[PDB]
Amino acid sequence: AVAQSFNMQQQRRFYEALHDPNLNEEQRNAKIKSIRDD
Fold first, then answer.
1. 10 and 36 in contact (C-beta within 8 Å)?
2. What is the 3-state secondary structure (H, E, C) of 4-20?
């Protein structure tokens, strides 16, 4: 969540959001394009 190294620090978040079939591939995609874009 707003890390100064959002690849090394932020990785588990992206994994969790990606591995979430409940969220359809648009809302799921928005989560990905938010965890980075913050």
1. yes
2. CCCCCCCCHHHHHHHCC
